[PDB]
Design a protein around this ligand. Sequence first.
Ligand SMILES: CSc1ccc(C(=O)Nc2nc(-c3ccccn3)cs2)cc1
Ligand SMILES: CSc1ccc(C(=O)Nc2nc(-c3ccccn3)cs2)cc1
Lengths: 193, 193
Amino acid sequence: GDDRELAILATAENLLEDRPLADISVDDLAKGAGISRPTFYFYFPSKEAVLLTLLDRVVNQADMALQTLAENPADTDRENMWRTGINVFFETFGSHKAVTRAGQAARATSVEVAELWSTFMQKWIAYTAAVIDAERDRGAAPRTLPAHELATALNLMNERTLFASFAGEQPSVPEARVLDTLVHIWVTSIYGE
Amino acid sequence: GDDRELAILATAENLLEDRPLADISVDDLAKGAGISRPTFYFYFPSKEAVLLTLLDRVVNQADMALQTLAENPADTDRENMWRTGINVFFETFGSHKAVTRAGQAARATSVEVAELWSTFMQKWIAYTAAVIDAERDRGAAPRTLPAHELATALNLMNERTLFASFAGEQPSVPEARVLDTLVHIWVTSIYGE
Ligand SMILES: CSc1ccc(C(=O)Nc2nc(-c3ccccn3)cs2)cc1
Ligand SMILES: CSc1ccc(C(=O)Nc2nc(-c3ccccn3)cs2)cc1
C-alpha cells in the first residue's frame, strides 16, 4: 500500500533527474515502481499529482527544519544566525534539485503547485519579518523599511537565486558561493543604515 | 508591410492583457490585425514568434534607456543614482506588464525566449558589476563580496520581485512600495560592512 506509493514517488524523483515531467509517462512511473498502469491510477490521478506530492514533501521538510531551528537557537552572532537559517533552504532544496526544478516550472501550469508554493512562502516571509521585528525591538537592527516588505524581497531573492544556482542557469551565482552571497545581502539590508 | 506587422504586434499585446498566450489563437491575432490567417503566417511563423518579438522590443527599450542613463548621469547622491537606474526597469517593464508576464512564463517552454532573457540579464549584471567596481575603486564602497556575484543576486532579486509585484502574486511587495524596497537592499548591500 504505502510501499507502492513510496515506490512511485521514488521512481518519479529518479526519472526527474534526467528528463522533465512532460517527457515522463504514467507507464514509465508504473514500470519503475513495479506496478501496472491501472494500479498506478489507484494511488495517483496523474503524473502531475505525483509531482505535487513530491514537492509537498520537500517544502514540509524545509519547514520542519526551520521550526526545529526556531526552537533550538544556535548560540552565535547575528550573521551566523541568518546563515544557519538560510542554509536550511540551501540544503533542503539543494538535496532535491530535480523536484525543485520541476516544481518551479509546474507553478506556471498548476494552481495546486502555485498555491502550495504561495502558502509556504507566506509562512517563511512572516517568520523572517517576525525575526527582523524582534531584532528591532531589542535595538540590534534599525527601523528602516517595513519589515514584512523587506522580508518579502529577501525571500523572493533567495527563491530565484538558489534555484538559478541549482539549475546552473546562465546567469547564476555558483552554487559554492550562493550561501555567502545571500547572507551578505540579508545581513547588510537588515542591519544597515 | 511593416504596418500589418505592427498591427499584429499591437493586437497581441492587447489580447495578452486579458488572457494568456495559450488562449490566444492565430485566428484571433489575424482578426484583430485585419488580415487573413495565411497573411499572418507571412509575417510570423507562430503566435510564440509574435510574443518573442514583443519581448525583444521591451527588453531593448529597457536596455536603450539604461544606456542613455549611463551616458547622462544625473547629478545626485549615490542612493539616487541607484534608484534612477532601477527605475528604468520598474517603468519599462511596468508599462508592459502583459508582455512581461507572458514572456516570464514562456521562458520555461521557449529556448528562444530563455536565450533572449539570459542575454540581457548577463548584460545588465555586467553593467551593475562595473558600477560597483567603480564605486570601490574611488573608495565609496567597501571590497566585500565579488562584485559580479553581488550584482547577479541583486539583479535576480529585481527580476523576481518586480514581476511578482506587477502580477499581483501572493506574496509580493505592493507595486507602490517595490522601488523603495529594492533601492534599500541594493544600497545597503553595495555600501555596507
Ligand atoms: C532565517 S529565516 C529564512 C531564511 C531563508 C529563507 C528562504 O530562503 N526561503 C525560501 N523559500 C523558497 C521557496 C521555494 C519553493 C516554494 C516556497 N518557497 C526558496 S528559498 C526563508 C526564511
Ligand atoms: C543601475 S544598474 C541596474 C539596475 C537595475 C537592474 C534590474 O532591475 N534588472 C532587471 N532585469 C530584468 C530582466 C527581465 C527580463 C529579462 C531580463 N532581465 C528584470 S529587472 C539592472 C541593472
